[PDB]
Ligand binder design. Structure first.
Ligand code: MGM
Ligand code: ZN
Lengths: 346, 6, 314
């Protein structure tokens, strides 16, 4: 059918407003929910329906700044929300010590990402503190953790680290050699990329791996042509109509981006079947409340609404900005970032 | 029916 | 102790044991974004959680408070971390915690924080005795649960429990030969034990797979395994495979088989085989068969593959 654009703009608007206690489990990931909504509006060219200034202040209130003594550098970055109870501070005063307050790699990523989308120039971001915190998250094997206190480690966070270094236009945030090693070691016998060595190759980790390399500008340098051909084969085999994340698994709207974006980075998305993909994505569109779901006749959420739209974007949907396949922001935004970077270089 | 990525 | 849904539940603000603590509220400032509304009970538990956290109070009451915080939201990684801090400080019985997390994971098998918690516990105890069985149960409500398989590989690798995994794999593959997770597990076991260099093993595996393919010819997983264990040694270095496949084509055909064939032919052209120009034609003929009738959805891809072979071997 058709793309209910306005319906989706309202949907994202509501996401930025208030949610039912039913979404309590997203408390520590509120910043990424914000990202889905903001980048989603950006992708639909509707950022005007929100107060960029208010939101920018809220975001900055989530930054874990270094304290006076700077004894918490290894823990700087961004929080997913204010759940710890720290007094609201839009990165105005120095950081207030707290035994358990520290950033989360996915939040530092979506946070910076949101700031750029909203037009902020990142001047209030303590770049060095963030990079210091990032470094602290990398393990001996090259992968990353989400928080300094410890957590699981895998490709998801390698991608987060890559995006952070890229946006701050400084790769001192990671030991790139070790990260690349981790990404190579994750390639499966079936040629896809898994969350880690030995694990089942997966659409999500393949995107994270490939996108990370592209962000480092080392795709061609890390994988041979023969290897890239094998990876391309694995990826393009994911299309059933829409895309699934693993062989013999049902399709899921968000993979239209995870896999689709990987195919785009590998310059072969053009050889996929657009109609069946578009048709599937639209079949998961909630015509009443707006947004998209993973499967048709399923409830919509911010993640699928966003990735479903980015999926449509990949095929240049009428009414949607082109999405930067590696950075996960609109090309328009990736551009403003380019200018921003030039600015600093003076 | 969702995707908990975090 | 006092369950959150107990008729006699009492807000922490009304509990005597908590009178000395000032609850700490959360504040999103002037204009909150993506604000979640919380019930009295919910906000109450967390206002006290913030209080205890802020003071890094390693008390028994704090430990009990985390149970409630977790019941309200098991996705709060900070709560689990603090709970681990307390588990140590109060030297709690870890075998008991194992029962706790076992119940939690069963209710929320797709939660990252709970699987991480269990892994930390197992490391602490250095006891993997109940892991394989626990995971097998979780895999019963979802044989493809990525968290379960990941945890399973960690345990097996960390405590070297390879002895029975290949058998577990054979069993699951019988339950559903299309489970891509099980095929990956099979490769995981073998490559970490015998390896595939033992021609006896390679032969057993190729034979095993061809058998599974014959039972269900349309199975990407089986084909990917077969190509996976041979692609690096050179697909063209196996003359009898090319023919055994061409013999299947008649009855057990599928786009996966045709694809395998194209791949064999390309390996040949890659190794300057005999009949360069003739082989390339056999390839191109298949590419087109894929594009026009066998794997139409990838029509443009296959034609792209074909054009690639032509401009590379002519
Ligand atoms: C916030 C943001 C944009 C982060 C980007 C970096 C991340 C976290 C990427 C995650 C990609 C991804 C789709 C990972 C897989 C998530 N799962 C749902 C894993 C295990 O659960 P299953 O139910 O087996 O998943 P599946 O959906 O693959 O069947
Ligand atoms: Zn999804």
């Amino acid at each position: 059918l058709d793309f209910l654009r306005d319906r989706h703009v309202r949907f994202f608007q509501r996401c930025l407003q208030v949610l039912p206690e039913r979404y309590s489990s997203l408390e520590t990931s509120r910043l990424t929910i914000a990202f889905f909504a903001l980048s989603g509006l950006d992708m639909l060219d509707s950022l005007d329906v929100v107060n960029k200034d208010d939101i920018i202040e809220w975001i900055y209130s989530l930054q874990v700044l270094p304290t006076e003594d700077r004894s918490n550098l290894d823990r700087c970055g961004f929080r997913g929300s204010s759940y710890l109870g720290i007094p609201f501070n839009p990165s105005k005063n120095p950081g207030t010590a707290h035994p358990y307050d520290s950033g989360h790699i996915a939040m530092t990523y979506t946070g910076l990402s949101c700031l750029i989308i909203l037009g902020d120039d990142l001047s209030r971001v303590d770049k060095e503190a963030c990079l210091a915190g990032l470094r602290a998250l990398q393990l001996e094997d090259g992968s990353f953790c989400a928080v300094p206190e410890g957590s699981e480690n895998d490709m998801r966070f390698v991608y987060c680290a890559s995006c952070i270094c890229y946006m701050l236009n400084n790769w001192s945030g990671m030991d790139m050699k070790k990260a690349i090693s981790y990404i190579r070691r994750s390639m499966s016998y079936d040629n896809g990329l898994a969350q880690g060595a030995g694990l089942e190759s997966h659409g999500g980790s393949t995107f994270c791996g490939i996108a990370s390399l592209c962000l480092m500008g080392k795709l061609e340098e890390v994988f041979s042509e023969k290897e890239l051909n094998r990876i391309k084969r694995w990826c393009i085999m994911r299309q059933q109509n829409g895309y699934h994340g693993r062989p013999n698994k049902p399709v899921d709207t968000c993979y239209s981006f995870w896999v689709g974006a990987t195919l785009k980075l590998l310059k072969i998305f053009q050889y996929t079947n657009f109609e069946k993909n578009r048709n599937y994505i639209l079949s998961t569109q909630d015509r009443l409340v707006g947004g998209f779901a993973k499967w048709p006749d399923s409830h919509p959420d911010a993640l699928h609404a966003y990735f479903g739209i980015c999926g449509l974007s990949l095929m240049e949907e009428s009414g949607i900005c082109k999405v930067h396949p590696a950075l996960n922001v609109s090309t328009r935004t990736s551009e403003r970032l380019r200018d921003l970077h030039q600015s600093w270089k003076t | 029916n969702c995707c908990k990525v975090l | 102790f006092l369950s959150l849904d107990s008729p006699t539940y009492v807000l922490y603000r009304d509990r005597a044991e908590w009178a000395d603590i000032d609850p700490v509220p959360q504040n999103d400032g002037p204009s909150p974004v993506v604000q979640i509304i919380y019930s009295e009970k919910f906000r109450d538990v967390y206002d006290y959680f913030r209080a205890v956290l802020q003071r890094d109070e390693r008390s028994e009451r704090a430990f009990k408070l985390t149970r409630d915080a977790i019941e309200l939201n098991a996705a709060n990684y900070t709560v689990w971390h603090f709970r681990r801090v307390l588990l140590r400080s109060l030297q709690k019985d870890l075998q008991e915690e194992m029962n706790y997390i076992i119940a939690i994971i069963e209710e929320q098998p797709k939660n990252y924080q709970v699987w991480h918690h269990r892994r930390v516990l197992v490391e602490w105890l250095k006891d993997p005795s109940q892991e394989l069985e626990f995971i097998a149960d979780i895999l019963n409500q979802d044989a493809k649960n990525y968290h379960a398989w990941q945890h399973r590989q960690w345990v097996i690798q960390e405590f070297r429990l390879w002895d029975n995994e290949l058998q577990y794999v054979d069993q699951l593959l019988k339950e559903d030969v299309r489970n891509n997770s099980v095929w990956n597990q099979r490769h995981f076991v073998i490559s970490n034990t015998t390896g595939y260099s033992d021609r006896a093993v390679l032969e057993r595996e190729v034979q095993y797979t061809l058998e599974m393919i014959k039972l269900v010819p349309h199975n990407e997983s089986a084909w990917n395994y077969l190509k996976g264990i041979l692609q690096d040694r050179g697909l063209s270095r196996y003359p009898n495979l090319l023919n055994q496949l061409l013999d299947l084509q008649p009855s057990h055909s599928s786009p996966y088989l045709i694809a395998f064939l194209v791949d064999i032919y390309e390996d040949m052209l890659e190794n300057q085989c005999d009949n360069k120009e003739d082989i390339l034609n056999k390839a191109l003929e298949l590419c087109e068969i894929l594009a026009k009738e066998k794997d139409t959805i990838r029509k443009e891809y296959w034609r792209y593959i074909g054009r690639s072979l032509q401009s590379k071997h002519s």
